[PDB]
């Protein structure tokens, strides 16, 4: 029998077979007093004890979150949304352990993505039984709240704090700094990754004083904090929540009485009015996500970075070839997953505006003119290609290039990745390339299972990253092996070096689309 005692109790897991070998795997654990009634809206509460024993044998509910129906059937979209029931009461976590039990492993933890309004620890491509298996790390997940049961604001006020999603998560690093040794984990020894909104909440964890001793080293997938989706000023945050109480019938004089209405509300009632809250509105749009709280946040991010006031330790950071594509297939005119998605000259401004609402005619004209020096003027797919990488390079290369051009500035090792491979089993058309999302299954090791149809090229690259991103936990180097490889050199501000990750060639590379980010990072904030 599968047994573990951990300070809340006693839990019980279940045996898995991966590559001739045995993982562990105890899913669903909780690690917080369900956000229920009186306790929504609030900072999670710490568990007491159970006497018995917890059957940590399958995934739990997922947050109350929206589902993504605009293409039903297919899987492209389908395979983010929710695996398991929704309701409020979702904290818990996950925990894979290798076979036979480590006695100080190092610790992967996960922190997933969704636009802080979706997302779950549960999906596939998040598994992690296969890095417990093939690099023997304990790897644990965690569910967290999304949307604005997990990031309204009233700022000041416990009933309703803010960035409750993100103690959600610090409560799970808290709660493997607690239990993990029993498991076989060193505590001293652990890593946050994540993907997208799960990277921006891996780097606003190294600016929090309080997540600083829950943690030792940090991995960035497609999302650091000074991306332009990533966070609230805190009056943003106040005027959004005072709309979802208009759109509701809770507005009141009270800020209590605001919320204590709120509190009675179904969770439904609360997740369709979250689209409204705000007057624009683009497909990257944040209704409700991390804000400036004077708790978890002690500042505007940038201004904390600037002065050096982070976690000092390593980071390792990077970003995907084609990021963008994925959000104009959900707005843009034009464009479609069924089409080739040639588009016109007019058809790209209108996609701009779609994307800048508040942006000067001026400004759209800039973005416009510097896109549009193309290499040959018809390749008629060039428009289609220039909203592309206008979205990808404002919204997650340019912000993650320069969140490790500062960190780095300040004295740690930063290295930077640049995924440049396509999936062969990746469900979106050609056009949209190596999409936002799709390094995941490649870093979870899901092409070492030869069952599933990828390819050997595919099972030898993920196998290469599982390896790096492995050791980078363990080492503080994201080494393959010491001979026969590329070395991966450190990001440093002058030269700038990063390394390619694909199929054909992983080469050593400098300052990363530099003339496209000088345009965002020099002239785009004087617009
Ligand atoms: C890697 O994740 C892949 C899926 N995506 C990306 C797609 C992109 C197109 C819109 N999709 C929305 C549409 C919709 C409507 C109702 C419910 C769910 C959804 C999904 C999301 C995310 O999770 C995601 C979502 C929002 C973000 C916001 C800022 C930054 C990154 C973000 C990433
Ligand atoms: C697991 O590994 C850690 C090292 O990361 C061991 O660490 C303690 O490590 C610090 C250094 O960070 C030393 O100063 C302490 O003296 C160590 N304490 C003890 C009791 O050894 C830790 O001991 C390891 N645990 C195991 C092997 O069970
Ligand atoms: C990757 O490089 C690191 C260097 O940082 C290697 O780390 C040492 O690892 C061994 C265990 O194999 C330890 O006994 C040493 O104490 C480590 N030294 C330092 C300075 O970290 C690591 O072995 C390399 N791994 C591979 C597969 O090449
Ligand atoms: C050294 O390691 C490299 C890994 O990059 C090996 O690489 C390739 O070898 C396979 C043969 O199984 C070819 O199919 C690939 O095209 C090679 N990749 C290239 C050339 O980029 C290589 O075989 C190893 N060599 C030695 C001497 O150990
Ligand atoms: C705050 O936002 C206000 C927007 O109000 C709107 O009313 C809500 C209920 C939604 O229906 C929304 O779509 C509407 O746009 C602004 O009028 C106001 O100026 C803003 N104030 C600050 C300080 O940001
Ligand atoms: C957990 O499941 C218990 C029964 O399932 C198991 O009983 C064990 C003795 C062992 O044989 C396992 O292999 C079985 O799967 C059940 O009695 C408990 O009530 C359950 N716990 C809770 C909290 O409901
Ligand atoms: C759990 O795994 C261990 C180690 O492989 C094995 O000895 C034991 O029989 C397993 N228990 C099960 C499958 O209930």
Redesign the pocket.
Not at 52 to 55: G, L, V
């Given at each position: 029998?599968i047994i573990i005692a951990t300070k809340n109790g006693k839990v019980?897991g279940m045996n898995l077979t991966v590559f001739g070998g045995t993982v562990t795997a105890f899913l669903g654990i909780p690690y917080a007093q369900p956000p229920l009634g009186r306790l929504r809206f609030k900072k999670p509460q710490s568990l007491t004890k159970?006497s018995?024993?917890?059957?940590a044998?399958k995934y739990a509910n997922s947050c109350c979150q929206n589902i993504d129906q605009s293409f039903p059937g297919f899987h492209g979209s389908e395979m983010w949304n929710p695996n398991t029931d929704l309701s409020e009461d979702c904290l818990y976590l996950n925990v894979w352990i290798p076979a036979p039990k480590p006695k100080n492993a190092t610790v992967l933890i996960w922190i997933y993505g969704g636009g802080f309004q979706t997302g779950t620890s549960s999906l596939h491509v998040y598994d992690g039984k296969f890095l417990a298996r093939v690099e023997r790390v304990i790897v644990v997940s965690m569910n967290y709240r999304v949307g604005a049961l997990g990031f309204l604001a009233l700022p000041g006020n416990p009933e309703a704090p803010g960035n409750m999603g993100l103690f959600d998560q610090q409560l799970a690093l808290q709660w493997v700094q607690k239990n993990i040794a029993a498991f076989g984990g060193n505590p001293k020894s652990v890593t946050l990754f994540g993907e997208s909104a799960g990277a921006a909440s891996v780097s606003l964890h190294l600016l929090s004083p309080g997540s600083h001793s829950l943690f030792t080293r940090a991995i960035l997938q497609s999302g650091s904090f000074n991306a332009p989706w990533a966070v609230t000023s805190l009056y943003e945050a106040r005027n959004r929540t005072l709309n979802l109480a208009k759109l509701t019938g809770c507005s009141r004089e009270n800020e209590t009485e605001i919320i204590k209405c709120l509190r009675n509300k179904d969770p439904q009632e609360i997740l369709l009015n979250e689209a409204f809250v705000v007057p624009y509105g683009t497909p990257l749009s944040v209704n409700f996500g991390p804000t400036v709280d004077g708790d978890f946040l002690t500042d505007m991010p940038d201004i904390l970075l600037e002065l050096g006031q982070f976690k000092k330790t390593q980071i390792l950071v990077g970003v995907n070839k084609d990021e963008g594509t994925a959000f104009l297939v959900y707005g843009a005119p034009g464009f479609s997953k069924d089409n080739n998605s040639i588009i016109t000259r007019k058809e790209f401004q209108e996609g701009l505006k779609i994307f800048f609402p508040g942006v000067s005619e001026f400004g759209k004209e800039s973005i416009l003119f510097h896109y549009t020096d193309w290499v040959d003027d018809q390749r008629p797919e060039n428009y289609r290609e220039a909203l592309g990488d206008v979205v990808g390079d404002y919204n997650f290369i340019c912000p993650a290039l320069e969140f490790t051009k500062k960190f780095s500035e300040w004295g740690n090792n930063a290295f930077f990745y640049y995924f440049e491979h396509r999936s062969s089993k990746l469900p979106w058309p050609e056009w949209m390339g190596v999409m936002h999302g799709y390094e995941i299954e490649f870093v979870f090791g899901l092409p070492l299972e030869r069952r599933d149809n990828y390819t050997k090229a595919e099972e030898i690259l993920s196998r290469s990253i599982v390896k790096r991103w492995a050791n980078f936990a363990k080492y503080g180097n994201p080494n393959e092996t010491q001979n026969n490889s590329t070395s991966w050199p450190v990001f440093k501000s002058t030269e700038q070096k990063y390394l390619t990750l694909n199929t054909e060639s992983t080469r050593i590379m400098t300052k990363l689309r530099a003339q496209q980010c000088r345009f965002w990072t020099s002239f785009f904030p004087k617009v």
């Open positions: 029998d019980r159970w018995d024993i917890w059957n044998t």
